[PDB]
RNA sequence: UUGAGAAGCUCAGACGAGUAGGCAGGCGUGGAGGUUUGUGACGAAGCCUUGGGCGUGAGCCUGGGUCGAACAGCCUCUAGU
RNA sequence: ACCAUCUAGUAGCUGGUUCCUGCCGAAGAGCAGAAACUCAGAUCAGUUUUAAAUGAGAGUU
RNA sequence: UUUCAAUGGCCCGUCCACGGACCAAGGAGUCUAGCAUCUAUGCGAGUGUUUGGGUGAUGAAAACCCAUCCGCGAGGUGGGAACGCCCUGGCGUGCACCAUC
RNA sequence: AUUGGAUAUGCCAUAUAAAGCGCUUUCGAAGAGUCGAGUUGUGCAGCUCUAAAUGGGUGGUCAUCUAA
């Protein structure tokens, strides 16, 4: 899949997406670097992608094949996600960026909306924590300077926006910003630091975990 | 690879075939130009959003 | 730094096929007009006859 | 790949030879500058070609 | 008092001993530094090749 | 006066051209002869291994080649030369065993009498 | 080589003078005025750094953060006369070979001054060492 | 507001002799590589001209006459310029 | 005496030495620039008052 | 363009003198080796393929490749660029460079 | 059409010969008006003198060559 998903032809790409679904439906537990090679050929997927109407559907299905994932590793699907886009991000040209500002924007909501699935069977606060724990050693990691910060004033653009849009009556009670406050309160980039909070449009009405 | 900014400096400065010299101002002979003046703008080669 | 992964492979009947090559990493070399044109023109000048 | 090698790897059929690196990263310059990281920290800017 | 001048004929070869000696020596020193650092070649590089 | 170098080029082809002239008389043969090794003369390159001129008395004798027939098979002989240690001599009967080893001589056509 | 502009041809070298243009002007940070002037030099105006004097001159007080990335507009060049390399993270305009492998392999990790600015587009946290210029 | 050949565009103010000497940018000629889907027997080049035009200039463009086979712009190279 | 090479014999000297515009600019160690630094939080002055005024950013290897 | 008018206008170069009858064409800082500085380029504790060898089926005096050598090279104080934290300034870190032990 | 060096084969082949390498209770010749020395002219040449046999030459007693 992963040749033909970055095909020269949009018709053998697709036909590699549609193919994609039973490969991640496995219920079988798949390495870091298995994710790490997909998402390689599925950057190129959304790279090559041609019209704004086109290449707005593909992102709505990519993040639309999140839930297809096992949830044994769903959270690996999209920690990896986050950690191939951080890398490549400096790379995509002015003319591309806009393309994968939308696919962060669905694949946010995504994390987003997989938390209110598995609220129903199990309790919110732990799915939020092992959600939070993603973010912690993703794009949110201290430890590391070099994700870039472009992403992370996105995150912070869409964050409740995404979250509001998920839950459109009433979002419960749960640590929802725990990545940014974690972050401004240890960043070692003080641009990240300095200017995160005037972009965050946090709440304070749901935040007391 | 598409630098679109390498490509300018390569043909903006150096050479392109579609250049007229003029006394004030350069030209393009390149059919896609909208102005048919050389500039960065303008230029159908170093831009890769052009209509 | 992202570019295209892989070339098209054509046949004589200019059709396309279905193996790609991985482009190689010479495309993503440096592109240096002002290196290319010194070094063009010293190699330029090495098959000529005294006079 | 055997004749140029990589930035890392060696070629093949050039003894111990190395594809030259490059002095920039991402050669588009108007993608840094017009970046989220770089327009969120910059001073507002003042008028283009201004009034007299 | 000091040495015959044949020594001073002979005090640069000497010299000479070594210096061929060391460079040969500094040359495969530097082969084997190049084999030590050496740049692993990044899994993720052959998915499409 | 000055030495101008334009028949570079045209020396490297004439020496080329001279090697495929000798093979084509001789090819199935080497173009060139065998060498031995030797060790320079000096504090400053004794410590190196270099081809020398050809192989002494005492090598070709400990290998089996007399002097006579060395020639006709390749093997220089240099009368010269000499072997003051062992290490030279066992380098050099090596080289000679191992070139024998590889040697395929084709054989000549001998007068046979038809009387006693 | 002067004051208004590189006498380098390299076009690489004048795209890195074209940001670091906008970031002299656009911000009130005098780490990209520094950058922009020194980017403006000649070859010896810009001598070449080690690695051994970079982990030298960030040691002793390294306890700090130490997040701050070593910064020479200039190459880092190797020093194969010490045998353990820190933990560095450089932004050069040219690494070695050997230097570029050795900070990689053993430690951190190696920017360019474009790969910089988009993490410390003011300079912040930043070691903007110099090379001695004794020839 | 479109006015990024960022080597572009735009605002302001001051200033202007010049030998030796220093610095910079340009004009021209013969040949070289690339380029102009370049020009040419419906006339190339050259030459003539109280025809016209451009540039502070070096110079360039052009109309007409004459002519009869080749020539030029642009980007680099070079020199018996 | 003549002729051919040496010979492009010997130069403190004579005469000559080919396009444009711009900028800086003397002398008649000093005078002129270039890089590098150090800089209104600095020193100066073809000046004057007294026993500070006024103009200028000042320097250095 | 020619001419007229009013106004201004003493032959050019060269060093009084010396060259100048006119016109066309030719006619003078060149090439090469050494050295020094400066700038650019590549690599960088290294660096330099072109003595030579390999090789080159479209021209083969090129381009490409490279064995063995060989050359050249081989701790505190103050000020201080830049940075972080503060409530102009203070505190910490302090490259290059210059006086200091 | 002129020839190269090879190959296959025929006929001749004065071999009662000629070699290479094993050994030794046997021998082992080696270049002179030259080398060298003294003195002049441009190592060489002139002129005067003129050798030796583990000698002679040339290098650092040793090494290494073996001229005419």
Known sequence: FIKKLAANDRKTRDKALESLQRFLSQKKK?????????????????????????????????????????????????????????????????????????????????????????????????????????????PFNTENLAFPNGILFHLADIWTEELRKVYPEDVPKADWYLPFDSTIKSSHNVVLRKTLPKRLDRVSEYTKD | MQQDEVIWQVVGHEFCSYRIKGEAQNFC???????????????????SRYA | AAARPTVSIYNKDGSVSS???????????????????????????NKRQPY | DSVFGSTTEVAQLKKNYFLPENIISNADVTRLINSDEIQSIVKAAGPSRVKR | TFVSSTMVRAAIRNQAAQRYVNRQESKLERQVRAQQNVIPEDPLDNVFA | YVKT?????????????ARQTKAAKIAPRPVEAIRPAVKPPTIRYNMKVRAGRGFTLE?????????????????????????????????????????????IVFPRKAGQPKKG | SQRSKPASENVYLKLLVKLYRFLARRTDSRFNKAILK??????????????????????????????????????????????TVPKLSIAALRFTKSARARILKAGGEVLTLDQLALRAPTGSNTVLVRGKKHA
């Open chain 1, 30 to 138: 798949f390495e870091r670097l298995d994710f790490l090679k997909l998402w390689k050929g599925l950057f190129y997927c959304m790279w090559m992608a041609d019209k704004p109407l086109y290449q707005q559907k593909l992102s709505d299905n990519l993040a639309a094949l999140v839930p297809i994932v096992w949830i044994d590793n769903r959270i690996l699907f999209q920690s990896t996600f986050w950690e191939t886009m951080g890398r490549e991000w400096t790379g995509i040209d002015i003319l591309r960026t806009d393309k994968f500002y939308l696919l962060m924007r669905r694949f946010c909501a995504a994390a987003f909306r997989d938390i209110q699935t598995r609220s129903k069977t199990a309790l919110l606060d732990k799915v939020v924590a092992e959600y939070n724990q993603m973010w912690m050693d993703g």
């Open chain 2, 29 to 47: 002979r390149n059919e896609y130009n909208v102005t048919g003046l050389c500039n960065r703008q303008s230029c159908p080669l170093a831009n």
């Open chain 3, 19 to 45: 193996e790609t090559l991985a482009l190689p990493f010479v495309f993503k070399a440096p592109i240096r007009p002002d290196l290319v044109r010194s070094v063009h023109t010293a190699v330029a000048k």
């Open chain 6, 5 to 17: 170098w334009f028949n570079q080029p045209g020396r490297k082809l004439r020496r080329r051209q």
């Open chain 6, 59 to 103: 090598e070709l004798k400990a290998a089996g080649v007399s002097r006579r027939v060395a020639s006709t098979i390749g093997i220089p002989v240099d009368h010269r030369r000499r072997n003051r240690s062992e290490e030279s001599l066992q380098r050099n009967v090596e080289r000679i065993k191992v070139y024998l080893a590889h040697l």
């Open chain 7, 38 to 83: 020194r980017l403006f030099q000649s070859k010896t105006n810009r001598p070449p750094i080690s690695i051994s004097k970079i982990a030298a001159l960030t040691s002793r007080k390294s306890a700090s953060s130490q997040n701050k990335t070593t910064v020479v507009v200039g190459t880092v060049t190797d020093d194969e006369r010490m045998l």
